[model samples]
Target: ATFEIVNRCSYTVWAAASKGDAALDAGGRQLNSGESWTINVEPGTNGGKIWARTDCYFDDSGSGICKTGDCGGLLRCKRFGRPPTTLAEFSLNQYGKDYIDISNIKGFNVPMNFSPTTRGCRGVRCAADIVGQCPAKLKAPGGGCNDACTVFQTSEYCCTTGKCGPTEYSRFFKRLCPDAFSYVLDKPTTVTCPGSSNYRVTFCPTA
Candidate 1:
């Protein structure tokens, strides 16, 4: 499968994804508003995630910092990004179908859209004003919103015991991004699509 990553925000976004032993979109790129990049996704990509970094500046050595979704200050990411990032997660060719979902488990940095272009697959988006409504304890340095689990690290929020339910925090994310999986037990957010269908991932998509 292939993924077309687009930046529809009014600012620059450094895109990123899991290394997965391969360079996804050259590991990352500086995508200004109206810019886009396309990359091929290999089969059997289990637990793969795609996301965008906001408010970043990189020097010639591909070293810098991003206020949101940073990965060891590398222009080409060598690992998973930091928190306060919205993720487009998927598993390709899994059980003869592709399982995909939008997730705000880390937090909400950008409004996003994940959709298929070749098949009649349903689309998902998390285009809410989460930053503005971010709780004071869960607000990051920049304009991103951090999840309660990242801020407090309690078993209630982290679900370490696998016996937790929606709190005011998780409910906030669910209310805003109903299409996104807000927590570990957010089961209904996932969807299945044809294994061969191409997908489009848009940052700051129209709400």
Candidate 2:
């Protein structure tokens, strides 16, 4: 997921709230106001379109919330799809028009649907910008009222390489225990080149 934060308001930092019993890793910890982190979702990660938020970060109204700081009376929780469900505890200040933006750059032609009014968004608020058309709801169901929503829609971020593709925050394990961590797409490799000989062989234990 490509997340960008434009703090038009008075330096509001961005943060992630924990959902229910799901605890965030050292890398996926809470963010400060006005700060934004770009995350790449890995395959098999839960992702969808439904977005719902109940409260602010650390506000444990229902889920096993993380109430450690001034969460402003909100419970933090995780959503399935991209742009995890946003907590409604915090309100956008003036000039805060562009707070958060999520997009999918993966090659798959997936559709990301945004509803002006949903559980997280009260329907009155629409996305500042979007790349794809809305789902049947966003698009006129039968009347063919469809908004051209054409952006990548997946909840996976690009953290496979320990780092979130250089621009994202480093994973908790990678930052705390870089040695024990391994790349999802990588495997232990052994290269054999005897005496500068141009002969090479590649082997995978399971392959």
Candidate 3:
């Protein structure tokens, strides 16, 4: 599957993608407001994440730190981004079903729209002013809102060892982003299209 990753935010973004231990787009690249990158997802790729990092500075050799959505100071991100960042996830050609979703299970940094470029399927979006409305406990020092689990790391929110229910924070996030999985255990908020369909993952979309 093809993924058209676009950056529409005012500032530059460092976009990253990872599937298993391998990297796509060599892990990531810098993109200005109007720029974008395209990538391919191998069929039956199972699961992986695509996300953006903001406010970063790198040397000519591609090493740097970002204020939000950082993946260990490397411009080429082979690891999952830290929490408090929004992500687009993919599960392609699994039994002929291709699934996509916007995830806030880590939290939210940039707004996102994950849609089927080939049409004939629904898309998911989350552009709520999460930063402005972030609860104090879940607000990160680096400036993004965090999930209750990210902030507290408790069984109640993390569900690490057993069953757990949603907290008020999850409800808060769920209300704002109905199409996103606020809690890791939340019912699936995924959209699927034919395996033949391509998709677009937009950051800070105008529409």
Candidate 4:
């Protein structure tokens, strides 16, 4: 399967993906406004994630900081991104389907839409302007919205121990982004598509 990462926003975005056992085709790169890149996902790929970074400043050595969604200051991320990031989580070719979702559990930076280009598949997205409307307590220092877990750092907000449901903080995210996973125990956030289908993730989809 292939994932076409499209940048529809006005500003430039640095796209990054976690490199698990199977190497990610488009590991990381600077995507100019309106540009798009495609990455092929080998079969049996699982537990992988894709996200976009903003306000980045990299030197000649590719070592710098991102205002949001920096993965250890590396150009190619070997792991998941930091908080205040919008995540596109995937488990391909598992259980006979491709499981996917736009996760805001770690909070949101950019608005995104994850949709399959193939037929017989449904799209799931979280395209709200979360940064501008971020709650005071859950606001990141530079930008983006922070998750409740990041703000409080408690089991209740984090849902680490038990089946903790939505809190006031979680509801804030859910209210704006009904399809994305807002908290740890958020249900019905994932959408399943045929394993053979190709998908596209659009940043700043509304633009």
TM-score per candidate: 0.95, 0.22, 0.95, 0.95
| Candidate 2 off by > 4 Å | 1-8, 11-14, 17-33, 48-207
As a TM-score, model 2 comes out at 0.22
Model 1, range 102-155, lDDT digits (tens) per residue? 999999999999998877579888998999988888899876999999999999
Query: Candidate 3 residues 55-154, lDDT tens each?
Result: 8899999887998878888898888888788989988887877888898989998999888989678888998988889999999988789998888889
Which candidate gets the maximum lDDT versus the true structure?
Answer: 1
Residue 173 accuracy (lDDT) in model 3: 92
Alpha-carbon runs more than 4 Å astray in model 3: none
Residue 170 miss distance in model 2 (angstroms): 40
TM-score for model 1? 0.95
Worst 10 residues of 1 by lDDT: 17-26
TM-score of 3: 0.95
CA lDDT of each candidate?
Answer: 0.87, 0.23, 0.86, 0.86
Query: Which lDDT tens digits does candidate 2 get at residues 124-205?
Result: 1222121133243323212111111212221223443353332121132123223211122222111211111111000110
Model 2 RMSD in angstroms: 20.8
Question: Per-residue lDDT for 74-173 in model 4, tens only?
Answer: 7766667788899998888897888888899889999999999998778988887788888889999878999989888998998889768899888889
Give residue 163's error in model 1 in angstroms.
1.3
Off by over 4 Å in 1: 19-22
Displacement of residue 18 (Cα, Å) in model 1 is: 1.5
